[PDB]
Design a protein around this ligand. Structure first.
Ligand code: SF4
Length: 184
């Protein structure tokens, strides 16, 4: 809990290790104080995978959903608490939901307006990707190479390129673990 907790998953240190899908989900959560079902699952199971405990997850999700009076804690408890507890087996279900790999993520229904699940390398325009990658300090040649992979439908190669270019078989939690090791 010292390293990964409801607070540190918002830190720059820990979030600098997130792949683009998780960054997108965290941004949608921060902006909207809510995520629709598929994004809730993609992000909550990723965070479980990096070691966010059940207690810290319930702190994280209830704080994020109730921010700015978006909903009362009563509403969170009546409409969402069970769903997050279920993801951690706290209601006795005896199914240990695993984090989604990239194939599972890509195989879910493609995101529409208001959805943040999926894979940005597939789901964003080249203009939106280039803007994000510029913000991550990549150069034009680097971005062209990433977009080359996206154009070919090779989304996990695009993501691997972004990893290589921002640092010194396909799974968001592997991206996180590899990146986190390079801080350590
Ligand atoms: S390739 Fe996988 S880890 Fe990378 S952004 Fe897409 S879904 Fe996330």
């Amino acid at each position: 809990d010292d390293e990964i907790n409801a607070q540190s998953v918002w830190s720059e240190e820990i979030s600098s290790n997130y792949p683009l899908c998780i960054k997108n989900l965290m941004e949608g959560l921060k902006k909207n104080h809510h995520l629709r079902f598929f994004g809730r699952q993609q992000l909550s199971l990723f965070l479980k995978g990096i070691g966010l405990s059940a207690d810290e997850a319930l702190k994280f999700w209830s704080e994020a959903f109730t921010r700015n009076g978006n909903m009362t804690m009563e509403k969170f408890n009546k409409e969402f608490r069970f769903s997050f507890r279920h993801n951690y087996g706290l209601e006795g279900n005896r199914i240990n939901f695993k984090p989604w790999d990239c194939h599972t993520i890509l195989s879910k229904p493609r995101p529409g307006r208001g959805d943040y699940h999926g894979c940005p390398f597939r789901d964003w325009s080249h203009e939106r990707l280039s803007a994000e990658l510029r913000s991550m300090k990549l150069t034009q040649a680097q971005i062209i190479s990433v977009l080359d992979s996206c154009q070919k439908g090779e989304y996990t190669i695009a993501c691997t390129k972004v990893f290589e270019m921002t640092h010194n078989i396909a799974h968001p939690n592997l991206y996180f673990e590899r990146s986190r090791q390079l801080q350590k």
